[PDB]
Amino acid sequence: LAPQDLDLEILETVMGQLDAHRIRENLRELSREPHLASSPRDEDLVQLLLQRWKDPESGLDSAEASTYEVLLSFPSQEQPNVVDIVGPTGGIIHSCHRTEENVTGEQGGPDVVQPYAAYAPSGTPQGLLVYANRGAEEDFKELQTQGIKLEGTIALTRYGGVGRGAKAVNAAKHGVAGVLVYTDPADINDGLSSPDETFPNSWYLPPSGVERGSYYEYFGDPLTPYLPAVPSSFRVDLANVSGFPPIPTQPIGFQDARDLLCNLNGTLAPATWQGALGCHYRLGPGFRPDGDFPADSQVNVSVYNRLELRNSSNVLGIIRGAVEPDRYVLYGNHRDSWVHGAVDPSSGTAVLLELSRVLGTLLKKGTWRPRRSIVFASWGAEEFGLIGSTEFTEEFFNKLQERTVAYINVDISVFANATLRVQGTPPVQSVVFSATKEIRSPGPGDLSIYDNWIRYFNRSSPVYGLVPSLGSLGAGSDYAPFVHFLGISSMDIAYTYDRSKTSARIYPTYHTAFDTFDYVDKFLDPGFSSHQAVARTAGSVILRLSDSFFLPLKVSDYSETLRSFLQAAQQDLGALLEQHSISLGPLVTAVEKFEAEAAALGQRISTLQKGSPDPLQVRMLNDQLMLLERTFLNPRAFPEERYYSHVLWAPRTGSVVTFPGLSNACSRARDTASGSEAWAEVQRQLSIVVTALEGAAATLRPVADL
Amino acid sequence: LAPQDLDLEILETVMGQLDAHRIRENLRELSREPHLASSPRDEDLVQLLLQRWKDPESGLDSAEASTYEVLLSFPSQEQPNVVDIVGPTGGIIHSCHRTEENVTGEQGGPDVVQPYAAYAPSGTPQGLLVYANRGAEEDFKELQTQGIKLEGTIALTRYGGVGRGAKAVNAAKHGVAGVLVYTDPADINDGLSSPDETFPNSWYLPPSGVERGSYYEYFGDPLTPYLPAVPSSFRVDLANVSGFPPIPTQPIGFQDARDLLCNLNGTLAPATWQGALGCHYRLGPGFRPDGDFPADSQVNVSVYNRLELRNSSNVLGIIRGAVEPDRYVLYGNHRDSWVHGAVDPSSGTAVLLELSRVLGTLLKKGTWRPRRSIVFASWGAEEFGLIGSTEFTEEFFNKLQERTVAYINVDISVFANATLRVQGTPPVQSVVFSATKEIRSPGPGDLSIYDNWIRYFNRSSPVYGLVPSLGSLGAGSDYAPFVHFLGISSMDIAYTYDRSKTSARIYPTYHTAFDTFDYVDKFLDPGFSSHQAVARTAGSVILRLSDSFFLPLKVSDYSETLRSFLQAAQQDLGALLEQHSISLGPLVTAVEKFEAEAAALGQRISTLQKGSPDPLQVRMLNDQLMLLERTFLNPRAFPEERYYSHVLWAPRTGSVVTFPGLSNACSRARDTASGSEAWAEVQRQLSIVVTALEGAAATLRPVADL
Ligand SMILES: *[C@@H]1O[C@H](CO)[C@@H](O[C@@H]2O[C@H](CO)[C@@H](O[C@@H]3O[C@H](CO)[C@@H](O)[C@H](O)[C@@H]3O)[C@H](O)[C@H]2NC(C)=O)[C@H](O)[C@H]1NC(C)=O
Ligand SMILES: *[C@@H]1O[C@H](CO)[C@@H](O[C@@H]2O[C@H](CO)[C@@H](O)[C@H](O)[C@H]2NC(C)=O)[C@H](O)[C@H]1NC(C)=O
Ligand SMILES: *[C@@H]1O[C@H](CO)[C@@H](O[C@@H]2O[C@H](CO)[C@@H](O)[C@H](O)[C@H]2NC(C)=O)[C@H](O)[C@H]1NC(C)=O
Ligand SMILES: *[C@@H]1O[C@H](CO)[C@@H](O[C@@H]2O[C@H](CO)[C@@H](O)[C@H](O)[C@H]2NC(C)=O)[C@H](O)[C@H]1NC(C)=O
Ligand SMILES: *[C@@H]1O[C@H](CO)[C@@H](O[C@@H]2O[C@H](CO)[C@@H](O)[C@H](O)[C@H]2NC(C)=O)[C@H](O)[C@H]1NC(C)=O
Ligand SMILES: *[C@@H]1O[C@H](CO)[C@@H](O)[C@H](O)[C@H]1NC(C)=O
Ligand SMILES: *[C@@H]1O[C@H](CO)[C@@H](O)[C@H](O)[C@H]1NC(C)=O
Ligand SMILES: *[C@@H]1O[C@H](CO)[C@@H](O)[C@H](O)[C@H]1NC(C)=O
Ligand SMILES: *[C@@H]1O[C@H](CO)[C@@H](O)[C@H](O)[C@H]1NC(C)=O
Ligand SMILES: *[C@@H]1O[C@H](CO)[C@@H](O)[C@H](O)[C@H]1NC(C)=O
Ligand SMILES: *[C@@H]1O[C@H](CO)[C@@H](O)[C@H](O)[C@H]1NC(C)=O
Ligand SMILES: *[C@@H]1O[C@H](CO)[C@@H](O)[C@H](O)[C@H]1NC(C)=O
Ligand SMILES: [Ca+2]
Ligand SMILES: [Ca+2]
Ligand SMILES: [Zn+2]
Ligand SMILES: [Zn+2]
Ligand SMILES: [Zn+2]
Ligand SMILES: [Zn+2]
Secondary structure, three states, rough: OOOOOOOHHHHHHHHHHHHHHHHHHHHHHOOOOOOOOOOOHHHHHHHHHHHHOOOOOOOOEEEEEEEEEEEEEEOEEEEOOOOEEOOOOOEEEOOOOOOOOOOOOOOOOOOOOOOOOOOOOOOOOOOOEEOOOOOHHHHHHHHHHHHOOOOEEEEEEEOOOEEEEHHHEEEHHHOEEEEEOOOHHHHHHEEEEHHOOOOOOOOOOOOOOOOEOOOOOOOOOOOOOOOOOOOOHHHHHHHHHHHHHOOOOOOOHHHHHHHHOOEOOOEOOOOOOOOOOOOOOOOOOEEOOOOOOOOOOEEEEEEOOOEEEEEEEEEEEEEEOOEEEEEEEEEEEEEOOOOHHHHHHHHHHHHHHHHHHHHHHHHHOOOOOOEEEEEEEEEEOOOOOOOHHHHHHOOOOHHHHHHHEEEEEEOOOOOOEEEEEEEEEEHHHHHHHHHOOOOOOOOOOEEEEEHHOOOOOOOEEOOOEEEEEEOOOOOOOOHHHHHOOOOOOOEEEEEEEEOOOOOOOOOOOOOOOOOOOOHHHHOOOOOHHHHHHHHHHHHHHHHHHHHOOOOOOOOHHHHHHHHHHHHHHHHHHHHHHHOOOOOHHHHHHHHHHHHHHHHHHHHHHHHHOOOOOOHHHHHHHHHHHHHHHHEEEEEOOOOOOOOOOOOOOOOOOOOOOOOOOHHHHHHHOOOOOOOOOHHHHHHHHHHHHHHHHHHHHHHOOOOOOO | OOOOOOOOHHHHHHHHHHOOHHHHHHHHHHOOOOOOOOOOOHHHHHHHHHHHHHHOOOOOOOOEEEEEEEEEEEEEOOOOOEEEEOOOOEEEEEEEEOOOOOOOOOOOOOOOOOOEEEOHHHHHHHOOEEEEEOOOHHHHHHHHHHOOHHHHHHEEOOOOOEEEEHHHHHHOOOOOEEEEEEEEHHHHOOOOOOHOOOOOOOOOOOOOOOOEEEEEOOOOOOOOOOOOOOOOOHHHHHHHHOOOOOOEEEEEHHHHHHHOOEEEEEOOOOOOHHHOOOOOEEOHHHHHHHHOOOOOHHHHHHHHEEEEEEEHHHEEEEEEEEEEEEEEEEEEEEEEOOOOOOHHHHHHHHHHHHHHHHHHHHHHHHOOOEEEEEEEEEOOOOOOOOOOHHHHHHHHHHHHHHEEEEEOOOOOOOOOEEEEEEEEEEHHHHHHHHHHHHHHHOOOOOHHHHHHOOOOOOOOOOOEEEOOOOOOOOOOOHHHHHHOOOOEEEEEEOOOOOOOOHHHOOOOOOOOOOOHHHHHHHOOOOOOOHHHHHHHHHHHHHHHHHOOOOOOHHHHHHHHHHHHHHHHEEEEHHHHHOOOOOOOHHHHHHOOOOHHHHHHHHHHHHHOOOOOHHHHHHEEEHHHHHHHHHHHOOOOOOOOOOOOOEEOOOOOOOOOOOHHHHHHHHHHHHHHHOOOOOHHHHHHHHHHHHHHHHHHHHHOOOOOOO
């Protein structure tokens, strides 16, 4: 007769049933063949999910596929992309490698998509080579400042620093004709480059491995901004599409990068532009007369990529809530990969299958039904730009915004096995702290997941003292439309490596044809105990959100973030702002009001917990908690971005670490004259934050107070 | 122990306590002096509301004023606006009257703001006069087509047809230098114009009466689009403000218009341009040689209006809900007038005071506390453009959007005493039908309010047969930001006149210095029984919404509207659309899905009503009903409009009576080539509607169905 609440016996049963061996075998099946979005293998995996989730003994209440027709991009099987060194008459002097070398048994066959830059256009530019570091605006500016002619050149860049497509966008502003991208061994392999030093001998990236990836500027289907890609939909004209790289762009292996960069002529690049290819790096243009190639040689980049409409499916599954079925706890993972995608995303999908098996099995026994609905999602086409998740948020925008408690994402479950790492908005911190305190870490000692985690990623809180840190959410996976466009509190959970033992930017075989089952089984997670730890963490978070009578969301945890952003503004912008007749006084007041009201709400919750409150009273409080995140949305704040409406977490390019709209506006206004449009936009961005925080505070106050 | 529900004994108590004499006395005090927004008398009325709502025996739980600093517009007391007829050197031949004649003892004091066009700029244009009918684009085009030189002219127009500011906008596209506006006796007085025929002898407009009003293009404070006009917040630069009339504009009495128009030279105006000033109307330019003025004479319009920032307050009051205090039934009325405002808005405020007295008194007795919160609002600065209500919606956007059941507006309670009229969105129809069936009409017979209403305004429903018709909501009062911007189901209730007995565009003394207590007391509602009838209707609607366990909102009533819009599109646009490869097929499907889902939801509610459902089950259903209106919002549908996001009720300028974005896009695209940007925008607007309806249907489905 007491209202349904978190049942710790159910929780422990679930934690104890998550089976590392089942996860391993899931991963073996998921990663056995390449599974690019919209491929026949992608469709086999859609059917696998459906079959698992419709099973009468271990399935969910229901499961269904939904399909969108979306604009993807592929290279040509008939005319491969090629990078050649050519002479004055067009004779080929040297050809780069076309695809990964069959080093581990799974590469080099027609199943493997050639490396390419998805959404980069076809073309056949040819010109003198330059080296442009990470291809940031400041990198091309450095070349220009040095008197290097950029018009008509081919620019070689390394992954990292700025997004994939941005390298081509920034190049093209200087009239660069084509772009090459490689991963520098300094950036991913702790400076190692040899066959014996790299996979299959270690987790490191082999010399022929090539990061594939989306080079589109935005996320979501390119043709249908703010509308779902259902067959009938308005589509932007292929000519009116914004966000494609403007020039042909092609990624290459670091062995091919070595041949190019280590032969360049000219000035030594800055120390910060150096790497581990094996030589000092020079800037170009062109090759050095004492090197491997004639100094009149050019680089020809021939690209044959096509844009192609394709069907991509999501698979949704649901366990209906027993008491509040119109509240959703959403747990999602993308399904599609660049090649075999054993790590990305199949390590997550293997966990998705195992968690959903345990809960479905428990559901089918009659042992349990959660208080709120649990919705499981297998997203399609994430590698092309979060397409499947984005289209879902556009199609079910209102139903999701009114009803979703939180979105839990597991993309890669395991980057390595040293430590948990979690990214998320502050309302979700408390529940993942709670969950990880009560699960044992698979690593040495006898620590909980939480006590191991804090040894790797921590911060000092004025409230709690030293605690594990939560990373902020950008657009690195399918949480992006949930947090930035729908304003749903979100979390992303993984296990990862120790940054004191490696500086790798990501696990080294990311997005290559060396991301295979053996890579995980031998190196990342032998025994699969880290996959199991992530499954347990995600399962415990999910059940705490789906079953607890009072929702375990602490909106008061946002106060530290707001205060931190306010302090950075006061310290680094306050004087500049004052010079322009712009006061931070209303912002101070709004942060103080949020702090006061979120604290008072937490005290009213604590007070009510001491008795036996009515279900409706708790539902009213749970609505204030879960809908708080929505108050930071303003769809007019960032008109030059797409989907970003959350005024706390939109991309920040300004140097001050404060509210991103304010930081970016001050950066743009800084050298403009008083009374400029750019200064007026600083005031607009500041008033957008103040209004958002005042409105957030107003939702946390007692609901019938004026 | 049963959940709180509508208590008919409380309802009848309340109906029986609403006192016509108290309403009359309220109105006497409210309209005793002019009460322009931000005037000292406006502030006295703020303090009156506060005192009434804080009374410990007859007040509410709490009441508070909130103030915004907003840009208003006023004429100059030191240099009145003047319209003169002048000779070739500037000598004044004739002067028009400056303000209403002191015909009833309340006009002509310095308390009475001079007639003027609020937000029209200062200037002193002078030119030949033309007559341009209602000042529509087509009216100016007619003049141009006839070879009339419009550059540098003064254009005389009559109120009606297009909005006030639009007359000036349309004039200025043709280089007109200044605009005069009058109300034609044919349009408001059934053709009568003499002193003995008009107030104080009848309800008709005297020859010196002048309609004041906002000539701003949008609503909300002009300086703070999409942000609340609070202290130290962003204001656009006076130079970059959109929406002001581009040229000086001045309204005049019809006696002055007679002197002007009846002396024009030239071609006889079209039949539909004629009127009752007492002559055949000609077009100009200039005056006829055989008339009162030399034919070389010009009209000089000198306007000295200023823009001025002013404080304007809202007063909010609340009765906290006993069970669901986080659900709001909002009842509002504006407080500010142009002059005495006895009809507009004080007849509404008199009702607001009496209804709030009755409920507050019942509350204080301990007799009753509503299930949901009732919020009462006295809006400031509505006459300048719904400013007080709009700023409140901006300030409390999220709290209002998540929690408001409906907004009930009473602006003018009584235009006259013949019949109820109600405007609102379909989900509110069923509750006003229920209320009005159980209250007696004050008129002849022994009819209910409902059975009297259907004799005047009716329509044939395929569901219900003949029923009273509900008008649609545009931007005629403070419901505008609730419905168009927040997406809250809204209603406006008034009593009005019999259109078979008069063709008056509105009650004739609207916005003049003849809108006085005696006008109401002697002509519109002697005995105040129609005011009482509106108070009962609003009170009954309010209690049904605030107290009922199941909310009396029938979202299935939307289906008739959707189907009617679809049919208009199929009949009048289908062929044109097909000729441009645009299919209505997805629209038909989306309408069908809404119809199906809304009907099935109604059946599930009916089923649940037969038992003793759990409060949480009913809260879930009530959320689906009240939040359905929100699903029609799309803040990207109408980028050229301000605040209009609701894709059903945005302004329609296209001739086809269908979804307004679609109607408007097809009307713009019709005279463009295949494959034009205008045709692409037709498809965008169509897909916006399809997506909205599919999303609406999705929220009405069983909440855990995939
Ligand atoms: C609804 O409103 C109408 C219009 O005001 C009311 O009818 C009017 O009632 C007044 C009395 O309040 C009548 O005034 C009388 O007029 C005669 C002239 O015929 C005059 O000799 C008397 O000194 C007196 O002032 C007025 O004639 C009458 N108008 C009409 C058209 O009937 C009506 O009573 C209102 N309904 C209710 C329920 O109050
Ligand atoms: C907080 O996190 C840091 C890592 O960011 C931990 O610092 C590491 O400490 C261990 C042992 O002292 C060394 O392996 C690393 O070299 C340290 N790294 C750095 C950057 O200092 C720190 O121990 C954590 N704090 C706690 C209390 O666990
Ligand atoms: C965490 O991963 C590391 C790296 O794979 C594991 O350590 C390796 O274990 C294999 C056997 O599976 C040995 O062949 C390697 O020599 C080990 N490398 C190092 C650096 O120790 C470690 O066992 C994993 N932890 C768990 C709990 O499985
Ligand atoms: C319309 O009438 C006004 C009012 O008489 C004229 O405005 C005056 O212009 C004179 C120039 O002779 C100035 O010296 C005055 O100070 C103005 N007076 C006021 C009271 O504003 C105006 O010039 C006329 N318009 C035109 C186009 O002739
Ligand atoms: C429906 O409303 C119309 C008014 O719009 C009513 O028609 C009026 O009826 C009476 C007498 O038949 C006359 O005073 C008016 O001249 C009529 N107007 C028109 C346009 O016909 C009609 O009676 C209403 N229907 C019902 C059943 O009450
Ligand atoms: C790659 O290596 C495996 C294992 O040695 C071999 O069987 C396979 O055929 C090779 N693939 C190609 C495309 O040559
Ligand atoms: C680059 O090589 C391609 C492939 O042979 C050739 O078609 C193209 O013309 C070359 N580009 C230039 C600029 O010569
Ligand atoms: C090659 O590099 C050197 C700088 O070391 C410079 O003097 C020379 O001119 C360069 N050659 C060309 C063609 O730029
Ligand atoms: C997507 O699937 C539909 C339905 O099967 C098919 O008719 C359509 O052509 C497909 N689109 C593509 C791009 O394959
Ligand atoms: C208007 O008329 C009344 C009533 O006769 C009179 O008392 C008042 O003074 C007049 N007002 C003005 C401004 O002349
Ligand atoms: C006045 O009107 C008549 C048309 O009746 C026209 O013949 C005459 O030219 C007009 N005078 C002027 C100055 O336009
Ligand atoms: C509005 O009121 C505030 C507070 O009293 C005052 O300081 C401000 O000047 C006022 N604004 C105007 C235009 O009167
Ligand atoms: Ca889309
Ligand atoms: Ca505003
Ligand atoms: Zn991934
Ligand atoms: Zn990936
Ligand atoms: Zn009004
Ligand atoms: Zn008005």
